[PDB]
Amino acid sequence: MVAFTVDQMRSLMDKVTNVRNMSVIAHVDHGKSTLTDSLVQRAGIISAAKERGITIKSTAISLYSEMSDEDVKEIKQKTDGNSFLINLIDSPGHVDFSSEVTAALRVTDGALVVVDTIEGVCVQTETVLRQALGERIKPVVVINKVDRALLELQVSKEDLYQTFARTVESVNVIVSTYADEVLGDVQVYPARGTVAFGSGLHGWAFTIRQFATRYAKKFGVDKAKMMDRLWGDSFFNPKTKKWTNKDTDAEGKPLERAFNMFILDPIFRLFTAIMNFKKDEIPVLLEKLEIVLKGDEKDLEGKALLKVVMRKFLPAADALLEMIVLHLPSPVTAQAYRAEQLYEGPADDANCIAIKNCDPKADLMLYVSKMVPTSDKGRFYAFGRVFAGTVKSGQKVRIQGPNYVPGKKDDLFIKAIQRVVLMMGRFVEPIDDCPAGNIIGLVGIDQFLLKTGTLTTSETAHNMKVMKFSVSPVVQVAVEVKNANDLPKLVEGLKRLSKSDPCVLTYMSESGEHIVAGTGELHLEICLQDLEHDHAGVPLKISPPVVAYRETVESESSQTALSKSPNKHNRIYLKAEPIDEEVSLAIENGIINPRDDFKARARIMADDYGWDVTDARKIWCFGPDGNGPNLVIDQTKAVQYLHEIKDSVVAAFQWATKEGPIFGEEMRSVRVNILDVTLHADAIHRGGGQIIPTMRRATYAGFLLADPKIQEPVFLVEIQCPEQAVGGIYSVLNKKRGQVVSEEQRPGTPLFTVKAYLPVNESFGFTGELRQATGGQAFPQMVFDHWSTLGSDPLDPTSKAGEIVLAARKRHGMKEEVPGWQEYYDKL
């Protein structure tokens, strides 16, 4: 549109009182693009001077505009000259709530909210506006698609007005409701020229002020008052030739409002005449309004003409530009009431002040809004705003991350800025510097600032409103080699991955699978990628990690269990019953140890865990692995060669409990009581290969008679997030048998710390699903917490648990049926 040299741009960048950092806030289909596009063609700036080339993803655009000596006097705000530099920063239309959006606005001071003439203000509209308000962004309105109502609906004039009327009122509800008391009445007033009406597709729009001036010069009145009248309850009676503050002429008759008589009328008459082909009235009407056509335009018809005559009548572009310049704040103005909020430090601090003043001579205070993709071979550029001091190419800056703390040296990076550039839509342009108050990009920060961050030149500097990260590994899957022979390389490469990525984690699952875990899904992504193509460079099959379970019993076996050796000579009679959870834990945590003296040990189980004191000294072993939470207590009476079979009964128990009868999982909280034992006179028939199997079977039998169940692992998740999104937590948690434990708020500033239990086998995907429910606001952090017995029957293929088992057996190539106890029991 207009081309400027790089110097010209720096000159404009010097008068920051004539700059406007804004964006366009709008609903999903309200003309946000046809409208900004309209502006761009009118005022868009372009690079002056104009296999190999460079490009960046559009993130901002620059518009230039000159005003009239008079229009610059209505600017109730420190100005400097007839010129202006508008910054049209792009914002995410459809992206989740608070992350992509919040960050973008933060570098804007004003907004241009687009509302629809028919649908009025919808949810999203009200949502982003509330968002913008939160950061104290002043709103200015534009009701769009006024053409739909004029054609399709055929609406009246007072009908339409009333619409505009409402739409304005709702917006003013949201305004007052979320506006900082200290900022004053930011409510939009059509009569004050802060609300524009028009059609972005047709190309026309208008503010009341534009009409209040048209009529102001001709008939000789000051517009101050002509504006107040041209909207609301002010009527002008042709007859009385005077105005009134009541909608009824003395005689009791209804009059026509000004807005309708002086604004809408002219318009309506033009539609109706050109849209009905009244080739005789068009000429006289156009003449009357002072709309001159040129050349072949004189012979247009219908829609073709409505657009020409309408765009000449009220160029959408000038209405928008008006409001922008005359009502939206400049940095100098906004950075004064927006300084505290954007600074996380002392509101009296040296820097926090250089923001308010928007002083380019203070200590650098540049905020990075986001990292933008570019054709420069995988390099990203930093897009942000210079809030204080000034940036320079090759400058030495202190890059502070989201965790950085003034004292502590974490997230801090004392590197230098390669180049400072202009982000002109899809193109960039190098410059020498950029003072406080502007929008610029930075090349060479890539690797030190992932996303949001603050750049400073002061060592006693604080960070600007920062965004929190997820830094614990949580996203994990099971990695395995496709050709068994590559195993050595998979292993080889897992130590390679770890040695390079300090934010990755690798380990062996209880169920023997190698495991890769990472920060986010994107992180795991890059990780598994490199692993298979460089670290290990071997084909791998990635999958959800297999969960381990615990086979346990619910009560004392309904009946005694019997089992005879394959000698038909020796028999064993036992029963199984549950061990208490507080106890099982004690065994697990080593408070009750099989290696500790019977002295200390006997004491603890009697004097601290209710165990009958005699019991303590008749346990033969804990298991599996000699020290697990399962006991074999000897309750026999007159077995001659008892002490003779002990060593065997033990090795049998250490086997049974390592791989239970349900599906081979480890048993937990299982206490086996041997009620009696009968042996053969000779030791030649009570050997190992005779007793071991007897006990193995015997135990299984008692076990299944004891109302079997299974225990599932359970995580203990911790979450941090803003008060509003604490809803998503409970939202998703419910869809996964979750359970909120505690909800504590960190004193100081909003950020809740939700804590809950999460069934390990309901956690695949959780991290992602969380991002959604909270629009990228919360970040999880898991850890194993405990075992929990499932209520359902493990031998009923259809029950919850029973499905868990079933699939398991199929995965192992075992029978789908779980051999009931009868299979192990040997009746007398």
Ligand X SMILES: Nc1nc2c(ncn2[C@@H]2O[C@H](COP(=O)(O)OP(=O)(O)O)[C@@H](O)[C@H]2O)c(=O)[nH]1
Ligand Y SMILES: C=C1CO[C@@H]2[C@@H](C)O[C@@H](OC[C@@]34C[C@@H]5[C@H](C)[C@H](Cl)C[C@H]5[C@@]5(C=O)C[C@@H]3C=C(C(C)C)[C@@]45C(=O)O)C[C@@H]12
Q: Judge whether 673 is annotated as a binding position.
A: no
Q: Considering the complex, what minimum distance in angstroms separates the CB of residue 509 from ligand Y? A: 4
CB-wise, 335 or 711, nearer to ligand Y? 711
User: In terms of CB distance, is 32 or 106 closer to ligand X?
Assistant: 32
Are 22 and 140 spatial neighbours (Cβ–Cβ below 8 Å)? no
Partner whose footprint covers residue 208, from ligand Y, ligand X, none (CB < 5 to 8 Å by kind): none
Q: Which does 200 bind (CB under 5 to 8 A by kind): ligand X, ligand Y, none?
A: ligand X
425 binds, among ligand Y, ligand X, none (CB under 5 to 8 A by kind): none
Q: In angstroms, rounded to a whole number, what is the distance separating the alpha carbons of residues 449 and 371?
A: 8
Closer residue to ligand Y in complex, CB, 510/826: 510
Rounded to a whole number of angstroms, the minimum distance from the CB of residue 548 to ligand X is 50
Nearer to ligand X, 148 or 468 (CB): 148
CA distances from 252 to 241, 246, 667 (A): 17, 10, 93
Q: Which is nearer to ligand Y, 629 or 702 (CB)?
A: 629
| d(C-alpha 203, C-alpha 312), whole Å | 9
Supply the minimum distance, in Å, between the C-beta of residue 534 and ligand Y. 24
224 burial class (0-12, 13-18, 19+ CB within 10 angstroms)?
exposed
Angle at 113 between CA 112 and CA 119, to 5 degrees: 150
**147 binds, options ligand X, ligand Y, none, Cβ within 5 to 8 A by partner type:** ligand X
Residue 505 binding partner per list ligand Y, ligand X, none, with a CB distance cut-off of 5 to 8 Å that depends on partner kind: ligand Y
Q: Is 38 annotated as a binding residue?
A: no
Please, which residue, 124 or 498, has the CB nearer to ligand Y?
Answer: 498
Which residues sit at the interface with ligand Y, rule CB under 6 A? 473-474, 505, 509-511, 515, 517, 545, 547-548, 713, 760, 782, 784
Q: Beta strands 550-553 and 561-564: pairing type?
A: unpaired
Q: Which of 334, 319, 277 is nearest to 302 (CA)?
A: 277
Specify the pairing of strand 398-400 against strand 475-481. Answer: unpaired
Q: Which is nearer to ligand Y, 512 or 813 (CB)?
A: 512
Give the nearest distance from C-beta 282 to ligand X in angstroms. Answer: 22
Establish whether 200 is an annotated binding residue: yes
Handedness of CA 714, 717, 723, 726 (dihedral sign): negative
- For the record, the structure tokens of 192 come out as 């004050």
If contact means CB under 5 to 8 A according to the sort of partner, which of ligand Y, ligand X, none does residue 223 touch?
none
Distance between start and end Cα atoms, the chain? 101
CB closer to ligand Y, 231 vs 779: 779
In the complex, which residues of this chain contact ligand X (CB under 6 A)? 26, 28-34, 93, 144-145, 147-148, 199-201
> 199: annotated binding-site residue?
yes
Residue nearest to ligand X (CB): 31
Choose between 526 and 548: whose C-beta lies nearer to ligand Y: 548
Nearer to ligand Y among residue 517 and residue 633 (C-beta): 517
What is d(CA 618, CA 329) in angstroms, rounded to the nearest whole number?
85
Q: What is the DSSP string of 462-519?
A: PPBS------S--EEEEEEESSGGGHHHHHHHHHHHHHH-TTEEEEE-TTS-EEEEES
Q: How far is the CB of 482 from ligand Y (least distance, A)?
A: 21
Q: Which is nearer to ligand X, 190 or 200 (CB)?
A: 200
Q: Is 201 annotated as a binding residue?
A: yes
With CB cut-offs between 5 and 8 Å by kind, which of ligand X, ligand Y, none does residue 201 bind?
A: ligand X
31 binds, among ligand Y, ligand X, none (CB under 5 to 8 A by kind): ligand X
Q: H or E stretch including 589?
A: none
Chosen from ligand X, ligand Y, none, partner binding at 760 (C-beta under 5 to 8 Å by type): ligand Y
Under 8 Å between Cβ of 421 and 380? no
CB of 544 vs ligand Y, minimal distance in Å: 8
Closest approach of Cβ 441 to ligand Y, in Å?
A: 36
Q: Distance between alpha carbon 286 and the CA centroid of its chain, in Å?
A: 54
Question: Has 28 been labeled as part of a binding site?
Answer: yes
Q: Least distance to ligand Y from the beta carbon of 715, Å? A: 7
* Residue 32 annotated as lining a ligand binding site: yes
To ligand X, the closest distance from the beta carbon of 142 in angstroms equals: 10
Q: Is 26 annotated as ligand-binding? A: yes
Say if residue 624 is preceded by a cis peptide, omega within 30 of 0.
Answer: yes
Provide the minimum distance between the beta carbon of 26 and ligand X in the complex, in angstroms, as a whole number. 5
CB of 718 to ligand X, least distance (A): 39
Distance, in Å, from the CA atom of 88 to the CA atom of 40, rounded to the nearest integer, reads: 9
Which of the listed partners (ligand X, ligand Y, none) does 784 bind, with a CB threshold of 5 to 8 Å by partner kind?
Answer: ligand Y
Is 420 marked as binding a ligand? no
When CB distances are held under 5 to 8 angstroms depending on the partner's kind, the choice from ligand Y, ligand X, none that residue 32 binds is ligand X
Question: 681 Cβ partners below 8 Å, 6+ apart?
Answer: none
Grouping H, G, I as helix, E, B as strand and the rest as coil, residue 390 is: strand
CA distance 546 to 464: 43
User: Which strand (E) or helix (H) includes residue 111?
Assistant: strand 110-116
Cα 380 to Cα 373: distance, rounded to the nearest angstrom: 5
Closest CA to 199 of 285, 88, 116: 116
Cβ at position 146, least distance to ligand X in Å = 7
Instruction: Tell me how far, at minimum, the Cβ of 112 lies from ligand X, in Å.
Output: 12
- Does the annotation flag 783 for ligand binding? no
- Counting Cα atoms < 13 Å in the Cβ hemisphere of 311 gives 14
Whether 31 has a binding-site annotation, put simply, is yes
Q: Closest CB to ligand X among 92 and 134? A: 92
Whether 92 and 106 have beta carbons less than 8 Å apart is answered as no
535 is in an annotated binding site: no
How many other CB atoms are there within 10 angstroms of residue 74's CB atom?
Answer: 17
The helix (H) or strand (E) run that includes residue 16 is: none
| CB-nearer residue toward ligand Y: 44 or 780 | 780
Task: Say whether 30 counts as a known binding-site residue.
Answer: yes
Look at residue 412 and give the partner it binds from ligand Y, ligand X, none, a contact being a CB closer than 5 to 8 Å depending on partner kind.
none
Q: Is 462 annotated as a binding residue?
A: no
Helix (H), strand (E), coil (C) string for 670-726: EEEEEEEEECCCCHHHCCHHHHHHHHHHHHHHHHHHCCEEEEEEEEEEEEEECHHHH
Q: Taking CB within 5 to 8 Å according to partner kind, which of ligand X, ligand Y, none is near residue 462?
A: none
In the annotated binding site for GTP, the residues are 26-33, 144-147, 199-201
Annotated binding-site residues read 26-33, 144-147, 199-201
